[PDB]
Amino acid sequence: APVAVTSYAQQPLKLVQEKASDGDGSAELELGLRYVFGSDGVKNVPLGVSWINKAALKGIPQAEHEMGSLYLMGIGVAQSNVMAVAWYRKAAIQGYAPSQTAMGYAYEEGAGVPQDADLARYWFDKAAAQG
Predict the structure, then answer these.
(1) Which of 24, 35, 79, 109 has its CA 20 to 30 A from that of 49?
(2) CA angle, corner 29, sides to 27 and 34, nearest 5?
(3) Do 131 and 108 meet the contact criterion of CB atoms below 8 Å apart?
(4) Are the C-beta atoms of 76 and 46 separated by less than 8 Å?
């Protein structure tokens, strides 16, 4: 699921935890990704959701996208197509290509939005223009 690659990739866990507590949004996202998707030694989904959410509340598009994927799949949160689109929309409107693609699939099937094939193409083509 996770498509985000933060600047704290492959950094030691102790450094990520310290910078996350200081307010570094990139470190909050990296710590949340490790708690949610990491191995059993560091896995802690409820804590990771709060760290991903803290980075997403700062407007970080990579963090807003992951919040949408959490609500879309119901990982650590109650599954919600509406809330998934709410987070995807915030990242897609900033130009984040993975969220623009997610917006396209939402309009194609009508998940969290009224089904609209032309609006699906609008968001699909927006991600295509960045390739």
Answers:
(1) 109
(2) 95
(3) no
(4) yes
Resolution of the model in angstroms: 2.2
Q: How far apart are CA 10 and CA 92, in angstroms?
A: 27
Expt. technique: X-ray
Distances from the Cα of 8 to the Cα of 3, 16, 28, 55, angstroms = 14, 7, 10, 13
Tokens in use for 55? 């980075």
Q: Write down the domain spans for the chain.
A: 13-94
Q: Round to whole Å and give the CA distance between 103 and 122.
A: 9
Q: Would residue 34 be called left, alpha or beta, if left means φ above 0 and alpha means ψ between -120 and 50 degrees?
A: alpha
